[PDB]
Structure 1
């Protein structure tokens, strides 16, 4: 997989070509205003060691940080997300998996409208990587969900319990 980050918008300035996970990109550029995803699915992180804001990037050219819904021009770590052949997630109503629950294998642009209940506080990712969004239609803050368990919002890096949409990381093309 390959990605290149540029310090200036419109693919200008100092840049860095990258093919792997990086817990700290500060040594190669101090800001990111544009990116070129040649191949792969990447999760950009605002701070080192995969913390702060998260941004999902699929192959394409991103002229401005706003094209990847960035809150700023900060990108300090990154993950090359693995290809998954299937996707399955269990959504619980209460934290710690308590309460009502639904199971899904498709994308959900609007969670609280689609199911028989509208409080979602814990997740159990069975297969695949997903992007949880704060607002319907894949808008707002983003949180990478990898296979595994998330009992409270604190587990998926969220500073808050807001969720409105969900999508399977798959591929752009």
Structure 2
């Protein structure tokens, strides 16, 4: 029962497009997106078609302007719903060095500052043991977002990053 609606203008005005599960290209129906309503569930929305470019995570809610999903602009073209397992536990292992090496830290908690908590500004590999997580380039859940749907991540490119810069992360909780 999850649904997201994109609107071409701010404040939920103008032409709109509805997605119910995974839409690899709505650019043909909307040339821009300046407000979004997320009715149920959590969604990943993407700048370019086929889930490419900058990514933004939107939990349920109303977003009357693109700044409210921390967007860079009104350019969005594809989206997929974030499917969470039940159970309700979250666990991540973050590594100082590539290929699950160097200092390891394991945590079940949101981390708004990797520097203050783990004394690193970079993550070079990672194992998500339980749940679903977001990595952020900057502290306090700012900057480039990356979605980590469990499994193992040998190198930053495996979570979509061009570099190991990660400075906060948090769980996607329904």
Normalising by structure 1, we get a TM-score of: 0.94
Which residue in the other structure is 1:27 paired with?
Answer: 28
Equivalent residues of 1:138, 1:165 under 8 A apart: yes
**Residue 67 of structure 2 is aligned to residue 70 of structure 1:** no
Asked if the contact 1:93/1:118 (under 8 Å) is kept, the reply is: no
> What's the counterpart of residue 152 of structure 1?
155
Unaligned runs of 5+ in 2: none
- Give the Cα separation in 1 of the matches to 2:45 and 2:127: 23
Q: Which runs of 5+ in 1 are unaligned?
A: none
Count, aligned residues: 171
Report the Cα offset of residue 115 of structure 1: 2.0
Aligned mates of 1:43, 1:117 — CA distance in 2: 27
Offset of residue 27 of structure 1: 2.3
- Given the superposition, is the C-alpha separation of residues 119 and 60 from structure 1 closer, same or farther in structure 2, using an over 3 Å criterion? closer
The verdict on how the C-alpha distance between 1:119 and 1:62 changes in structure 2, with shifts beyond 3 A counting, is closer
Structure 2 length normalisation: TM-score? 0.93
Question: What residue is the counterpart of 2:98 in the other structure?
Answer: 95
CA drift of 1:118 comes to: 5.1
Q: Does the Cα contact within 8 Å between 1:51 and 1:157 map onto a contact in 2?
A: no
**Superposed displacement of residue 15, structure 1:** 0.3
Match of 1:12 in 2: 13
CA distance in 2 between counterparts of 1:71 and 1:151 reads 28
Q: Who is 1:2 aligned against? A: 3
Q: Using the TM superposition, name which of 41-50 and 118-127 deviates more.
A: 118-127
Aligned to 2:130: 127
